[PDB]
Amino acid sequence: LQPFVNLLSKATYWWMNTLIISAHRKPIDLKAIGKLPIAMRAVTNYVCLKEAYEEQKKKTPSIWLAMYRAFGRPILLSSTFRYLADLLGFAGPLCISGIVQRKEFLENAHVLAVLLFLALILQRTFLQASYYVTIETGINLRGALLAMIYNKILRLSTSNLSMGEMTLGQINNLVAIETNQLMWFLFLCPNLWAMPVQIIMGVILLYNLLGSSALVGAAVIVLLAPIQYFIATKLAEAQKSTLDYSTERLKKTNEILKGIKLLKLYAWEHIFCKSVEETRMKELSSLKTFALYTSLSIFMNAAIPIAAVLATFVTHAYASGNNLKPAEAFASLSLFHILVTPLFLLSTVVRFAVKAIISVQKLNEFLLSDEIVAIKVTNGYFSWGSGLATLSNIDIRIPTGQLTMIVGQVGCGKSSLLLAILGEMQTLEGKVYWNRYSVAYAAQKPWLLNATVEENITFGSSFNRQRYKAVTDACSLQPDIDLLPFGDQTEIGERGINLSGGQRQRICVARALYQNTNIVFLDDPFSALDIHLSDHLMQEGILKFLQDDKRTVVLVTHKLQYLTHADWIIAMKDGSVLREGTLKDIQTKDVELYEHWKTLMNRQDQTTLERKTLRRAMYSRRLRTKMPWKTCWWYLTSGGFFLLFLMIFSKLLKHSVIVAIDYWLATWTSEYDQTFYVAGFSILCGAGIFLCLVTSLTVEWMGLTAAKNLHHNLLNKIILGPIRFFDTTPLGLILNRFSADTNIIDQHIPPTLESLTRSTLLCLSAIGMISYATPVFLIALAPLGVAFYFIQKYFRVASKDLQELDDSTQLPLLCHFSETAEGLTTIRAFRHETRFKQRMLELTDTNNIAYLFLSAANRWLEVRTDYLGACIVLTASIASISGSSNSGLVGLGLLYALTITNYLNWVVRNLADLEVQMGAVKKVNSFLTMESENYEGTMDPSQVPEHWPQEGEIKIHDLCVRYENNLKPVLKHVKAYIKPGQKVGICGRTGSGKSSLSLAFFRMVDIFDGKIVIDGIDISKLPLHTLRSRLSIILQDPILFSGSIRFNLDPECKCTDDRLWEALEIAQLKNMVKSLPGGLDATVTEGGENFSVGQRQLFCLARAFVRKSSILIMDEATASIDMATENILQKVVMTAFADRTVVTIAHRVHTILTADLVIVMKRGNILEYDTPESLLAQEDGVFASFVRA
Ligand SMILES: CCOc1cc(CC(=O)N[C@@H](CC(C)C)c2ccccc2N2CCCCC2)ccc1C(=O)O
Ligand SMILES: Nc1ncnc2c1ncn2[C@@H]1O[C@H](COP(=O)(O)OP(=O)(O)OP(=O)(O)O)[C@@H](O)[C@H]1O
Ligand SMILES: Nc1ncnc2c1ncn2[C@@H]1O[C@H](COP(=O)(O)OP(=O)(O)OP(=O)(O)O)[C@@H](O)[C@H]1O
Ligand SMILES: [Mg+2]
C-alpha cells in the first residue's frame, strides 16, 4: 500500500508541507533546502545534452533535436497529464447541464454532484502534476544549457578578431535572457498543444449544447486571440521605448550620485535634477502609451467574453422556436468562462515560442564560434587567426629553473609570444615542447575575481600563512592591504573595493608567486610600479623567493634594468627574435644591441599618492509575515483620493453589473415575447463593457500618477540630502533605489494590484451570490474560510522567503559567468579549468534548486486551494439540489461555485506578489524621508550684498569641525585671519584636516565650535546655496559629466559665450577646444575620460574663472598632474587669479613656498601661521622638515 500513499504525496506535494510550515520558525536557508536529487543534478543533464548534441553532430547541428532527444519523455508525460486534465475539466459544464435539468441513475442529480466533485479534483490534480513535470524538465534544460555554454566559454579563444568588445555583452545576454526565455518556452510548451485542442473541444461542446447559434459567440471569442497578440506586440514596442528612456535616466542618475559632493560644492545639483526630471518626463510620456496598451488588453480580455455572451444569447433568442432553457444557457456560460483563459493566453504562448526560436538561433550562432630546458620551440610560426603570422621564426628556448627575460619594443609581440607558448593562438607551423604542467601567469592586463583578497592570493591553493605573509611582504602589499576596511577578506574587483592599476597588478603578481608551480610567467608586472616598489619586488620577490623554490621564471619587461640579474635574455623585433642569450652572449655576438640598451638606459610618488586616496575612502568606516498595509495605503493615496475613489467605485460598479447580467440571464431562463428580456440583457452588456473600459483606464491612470509622484519626490529628497548620507550609504543601494524599485513601482504594481482587486471582487461576488441562492452555504463556507486564511498566511511567508533566496542565489551565477568570461587566458594558464567548472556546477545547482522549490511551493498552494474549491463546489451543488429554489438560481450558484476555483488561488498569489512589491514601495518611501540640510538663511538675501564675496576678507574664530555629531572634533580652536588679496598655503602631515578646513569654509562639515567670517558675515548666518554659488573650488580630481563643453563651463547658462571663450583662453584651454570639432559645443563623455587629466584640471580652472567667485580654493590640485601641466597651473594661479584670494592645500610644499603666507596643520591644530620664509628662518619646525625633504 505504501506506493499508493507515496504517489498521493507526490501529487499533493506532501513533502512541501514540512518546509512550508517551518517557514515561520526559520527563514528558508539553502541548507534547510535538501540538495538536488542525483537524477536532477545539472551535471547529469549536461551529460545527456552533450551526448545528444554530439549524436546530432555525427550526421549544422541543431539544438532543438538535442533537447528533444534529452527531455522528450517528461514532455510527453506532461502532455498526457494536460490533455487528461482538460478533458476532465470539460466535465464542469456538462455536470452543470445535467444537475440543472434535474438504470441510468446519472440523472438522479445527486450522484452527478459527487461525480462533478471527483472529476474536478482529478482534473486539477492532473493539471498541477503536468505543471510540475514541465517545470522540472524546463529547469533541467536551463541547467544543461548553462553548463554547455560555460564549457564553450572555457574553450573560447581570445583573438581580437573573434572576441570583440561585444563578446562579453553577448555572453551576459545569453546567460541572463536567452537561456531564461528558452526555459520559459519549455515551461509553456505543453500549452502550445493543450490550448488549441481545448478551444476546439469547447467550440464543439458549445455547438452541441446551444446549436448553430453559438457560432456567433465562438467567432467573437476566437477574435480575442489576434487582438491580444496585436496589443501585446504594441506593448512590447512601448516597453522597449520605455527601457531606452529608463537606461538613459539611470545613466544620468548614476553619474549624478557619483561625485555628488562635487555638485554640492558647485551648487549645480538643481540643474542636474532638472535635467533628470526632463528625462523622467519623457520616460513617463512613453510609459503612458505602455499603460494605454496594457489597459486596452485588460479591457479586451474582460469585455470580449461579455460581447460573445450577448451575441450568443440574442441570436439564440431570435433564432429558436424553443425558448432559452436554463441548463443550456448556464452550461454555455461556464464554457465561455472556461475558454476565455486559453484564448487569452495562446497569444502569449506564441510570443514565447517566437522568442525561443530567436534565442535558440542566437545560442547556436554563439556555440558555432571560434575556439583554441623548461620549454623549447623550433621553427615556430603563430598568428591570431588573421592568416598572417604575427610571430615568425620562433626559435625560443626556456632554460629550466632559471630567470629568463624578454626585451623588445612597444607592440613587439612579447605578450603574443607568451600567449603562443601557452598555446592560446593558432600555430601555423612549428612545435613547442614541455620538459603540459600548469604555469603561473600574470596577464599584462591585471584580472581579479569578486571574492576577497585572500581568495585572489590563494586562487584555490591551500592556505599557508607562511607563504601568504612572505609573498605579501615581497610585493610590499601589506600596507595597502591594511588600508582596506577589513584588510583581507575584503571584496575587490568590479563589485568590491575599487583598486588602482598598480595595486591590481601587485595583487596579480602576488597570486602568481604564491601559486605552487614550476613555471611562472610575469608579463610586465611593473606596468604602473614605482622605482622603489619594483626594486623591492625584484630583489626580494622575483629572485630570492623563487631562488629558494628553484622555479623557472620567464619575465617580460620594457624596463631594461635588472637585466644583470637575469640568467637568460631574449631579444625580439617585429614579431621575431633578433637574438637570445645572456648579457655576455649578446655582448659578444651583438655589440651594437648590447650598447643600445645602455644607450637607452643611460638616456633615462604615485604609490604614496595611491594609498592616500585609498585611506581617504576608509575614513568613514520578529514577525516577518505581516504585509505593510500602511505602506500600501500610502501608495494608493499617493495618486490622489479622487483617483482612488474613482477606481474603487468603478470596479465595484463593474462587478455589480456583471453579476446583474448573470442574474438577469437566470431570471430570463426562469420561464418554461422575449423582447423585454433581450433588450434588458443588451443594455446590461453595454453598461458592463463601458464600466470595464472605465475601470481599466482608471487603474492605469492611478498607477502612472503614483509612479510620477513617488519618483519625483524621491529624487528631490535624495538630492537635497546631506553629504553624510552618500558618505555612509554605498552608492549601489542608492542607485538601486531608482534602478529596480522605481521599475517595480512603474510596471509591476499597477497590473498586480488590478489583478488582485479583480480576483478579490470576483471571489466575494461569487460567494455572496451562491449564498443568495443557497443561504445554508455559509455554514460549510466558514471552515473553508479558516483553511483559506491559514493557507494564505503560510504560502505568503514561504513564497517571500523562497523568492528572496532565489534572487540572492542567482546573482553570484551571473557574477561568475561574467568573471570567467574574462581572464580566460589566466585560467587556462593556471589550468584551473576543472575548479571553475565545478564552481559553476555548484552555483547553477543552487540556483536551480531554489527556483524549483519556489515553483513547487506555488504548486502546493494551487493544489490546496483547489481542494478547497472542490469542497466549495460539492457543498454548493448538494445544498442547491437539496434546497428548494428556482432553477435559474441553481444554475447561477453552480456556475459561480465552479468558477470560484479559478480565482481562489490567484487572489492569494497576487496578494503575495503585491506584498513583495510593497516591500520595495516601503524601501522607497522610507528612503525619501531622510532629513535635509538647513538651506534656510537667517539673514535676508537682500541684506547680504549681491557682490558679497568681492572684498575677499576671511576670518576664523576658534573654529572646530566635526564630520558627524558625537565624534571627536577633527578641528579644534582653529583661528585664522586671511587678509584680502592674499595667497594662503596649507601643508602638514596627511590627515590633519586640511580638506576638512576647506569643507568648513563651504559649510559642508558641521562647525561645532567657533565660526568662519567672510566680509564680516558669518558663513552660518547665510543660505548655504548663496555661499556655494559665489565660491570657487578646485578638487584634487576634477570630474566632468557627460555633455557639451558649455554645459560643463556653466550649466546655469548665465554667462555669454564670450565669457566662456575668455575663460578657456586664460586657462590655456582655448586652443584645445578649438582644435576639437564643435568648439564650445563639442561633446564630453561622463567622468572627463574624453580629455586628459591636465585638461580636466584646466576645465576646472575655467569653471572657477567663469564663476567670478572672487575667492579660490585648491585641494592639492597638482596631485597626479604632469610637471609641465603643474607649471602651467602654477602660472595661471599666479597671474589669472592675481586679484583673487587663493587658499591652497599644498600636496608638496615647494609648489607653495612662494605663497604670501603659509599655515601648518597638525591634528587639527595650527602649529604655524606666518610667511613660509619666516618659519624656515625662525626655527626648524615641521614645515622646515617636510619642506626641506
Ligand atoms: C514560474 C511559472 O511556473 C508556472 C508555469 C506554468 C505552465 C503553464 O502552463 N502556464 C500557463 C497558465 C495556464 C493556466 C494556462 C500560461 C500560458 C501562457 C502564458 C502564461 C501562463 N501562465 C504563466 C504562469 C502562470 C500564470 C500564466 C503554470 C503555472 C506556473 C506557476 O508558477 O504558477
Ligand atoms: N589576443 C590578441 N588577439 C589578436 N591580436 C593580438 C592579440 N594580442 C596581441 N595582438 C596583436 O599582436 C601584435 C603584438 O601584440 P602583443 O600584445 O603580443 O605585443 P607586445 O610587444 O607584447 O605589446 P605590449 O606593448 O602591449 O606589451 C599587435 O598587432 C597586437 O595587436
Ligand atoms: N568622510 C569622513 N567622515 C568622517 N570623518 C572623516 C571623513 N573624512 C575624514 N574624516 C576625519 O578627518 C580627518 C582628516 O580629514 P581630512 O581628509 O579633511 O584631512 P587632511 O589632512 O586634509 O587629509 P588628506 O591627506 O586627505 O588631504 C581624518 O583623519 C578622519 O579622522
Ligand atoms: Mg602586450
Ligand SMILES: [Mg+2]
Ligand atoms: Mg584631506
